[PDB]
């Protein structure tokens, strides 16, 4: 009714506050407006917690590859704008999506393995406590480096439709995500892969 109009007006509000040019915003539907809104708040919450614990553009352009952050559950918490130069997917297509949808089926299991602290994903909170308490390069930093090759869905490839990429980075705690238990208590932050994704030539 008029309520459906009230809901849609707030979605329009949200869309107009998204940090992208009007030509990108106008192409988004209501579902992406929400996805990207959530995406934006999650990233700002992370940096707020990092701020509490106390170029750039040229460095981004210098890399042969794009910056990528994947959460413990395989969510694309951040992808830099240059992702489009490698895969044809825009930053807005990818943000807060499931990483496994963009990974070749036969590599998905490996990629999942790379996200786990011991490369042993279940098919645990106590040891992450030590890793968390160790921070604020800790004792455990040598166990959390990651360098692997994976096939990534690529709209710029006309053969397999996949680009073979090397993912190089570290597992770091993704703060400020405000996950909560059934009881209501705030869950501790989980490890996410902070990496550069570069094509193997």
């Amino acid at each position: 009714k008029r309520h459906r109009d009230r809901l849609n007006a707030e979605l329009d509000h949200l869309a107009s506050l998204l940090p992208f040019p009007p030509d990108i915003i106008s192409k988004l539907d209501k579902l992406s407006v929400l996805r990207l809104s959530v995406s934006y708040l999650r990233v700002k919450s992370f940096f707020q917690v990092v701020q509490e614990q106390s170029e750039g553009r040229l460095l981004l352009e210098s890399l042969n590859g794009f910056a990528l952050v994947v959460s413990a559950e395989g969510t694309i918490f951040y992808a830099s704008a240059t992702i489009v130069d490698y895969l044809g997917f825009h930053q807005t297509d990818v943000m807060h999506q499931n990483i496994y949808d963009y990974i070749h089926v036969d590599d998905r299991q490996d990629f999942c393995r790379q996200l786990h602290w011991a490369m042993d994903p279940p098919q645990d909170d106590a040891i992450l406590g030590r890793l968390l308490r160790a921070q604020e390069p800790t004792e455990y930093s040598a166990f959390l480096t990651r360098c692997f090759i994976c096939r990534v869905r690529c709209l710029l490839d006309s053969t397999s439709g996949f680009l073979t990429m090397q993912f190089q980075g570290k597992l770091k705690f993704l703060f400020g995500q405000k996950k909560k238990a059934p009881s209501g208590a705030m869950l501790p932050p989980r490890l996410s892969l902070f990496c550069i994704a570069a094509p193997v030539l």
């Binding site: 040019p21 700002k44 480096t145 996950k179």
Partner: protein, 263 residues
């Protein structure tokens, strides 16, 4: 139809996430409906993006943080005719132990030798991206990628380390595929074998003692250095770091996790 519940649900799930991320919204006693969650999301989002002007997901310093969390390096800028050491990042000092002021208006040769530096002499000319590997540095690896517009390049660190897991005796129960490049073996050639079987005779007591001590450290890390027999039959110096943990699923006794680095 009513055929598309999946988009209807996704919206609802996103609305719930907005409720979690909007500070005052989660703290409310009365569980707010969709409209009021959205309105609070608007206010908070408006507050975050600020009073204009141009839209950007991350600010420049935030982007910098993400790159330097993932990679380990620094930005350096030079010219073809002159030196010219134009600009260097503040995160140059942690990458290679040498202070900030030493690059400002100083010689380019000082940290790159020995002794050529003949490759870079013609790399400067336009003939256009120009990526390369360079000699830096022993005081007291820099694979630098960049583009010409005068060069603008990062100075950054392939695998030299691998993870493994072991039972209490030292038997490989899991091997990270980075072992191939580092010690020459496929995971299958190490699984089932004891790590001590790849340890040089003179290092065996040291290695056994280290595994007895790591158990007593109860989750704290100990490093040890020893000679590991690679696939090509050469002895390779390796630093292993190791700690135990109580594995749930098996309740199984202490589980050794190791990272193995060729120095």
């Amino acid at each position: 139809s009513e055929i598309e519940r999946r988009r209807r649900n996704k919206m609802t799930a996103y609305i719930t996430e907005l409720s979690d991320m909007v500070p005052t919204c989660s703290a409310l006693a009365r569980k707010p409906d969709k409209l009021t969650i959205l309105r609070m999301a608007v206010s908070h989002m408006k507050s975050l993006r600020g009073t204009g002007n141009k839209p950007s997901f991350l600010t420049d310093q935030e982007l910098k943080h993400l790159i330097l969390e993932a990679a380990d390096g620094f930005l350096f800028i030079v010219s073809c005719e002159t030196g010219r050491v134009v600009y260097v990042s503040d995160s140059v000092t942690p990458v290679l132990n040498q202070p900030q002021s030493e690059w400002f208006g100083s010689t380019l040769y000082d940290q790159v030798h020995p002794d050529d530096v003949d490759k870079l002499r013609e790399q400067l000319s336009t003939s256009s991206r120009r990526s390369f590997i360079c000699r830096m540095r022993c005081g007291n690896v820099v694979h630098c990628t960049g583009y010409i517009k005068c060069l603008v390049a990062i100075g950054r660190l392939q695998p030299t380390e691998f993870i493994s897991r072991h039972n209490i005796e030292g038997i490989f129960t899991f091997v990270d595929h980075r072992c191939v490049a580092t010690v020459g073996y496929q995971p299958q050639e190490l699984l089932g074998k004891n790590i001590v079987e790849f340890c040089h005779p003179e290092d065996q007591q040291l290695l056994r003692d280290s595994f007895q001590q790591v158990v007593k450290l109860k989750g704290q890390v100990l490093s040890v250095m020893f000679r590991f027999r690679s696939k090509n039959r050469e002895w390779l110096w390796v630093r292993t770091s190791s700690f135990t943990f109580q594995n749930p699923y098996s309740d199984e006794i202490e589980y050794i996790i190791c990272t193995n680095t060729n120095v």
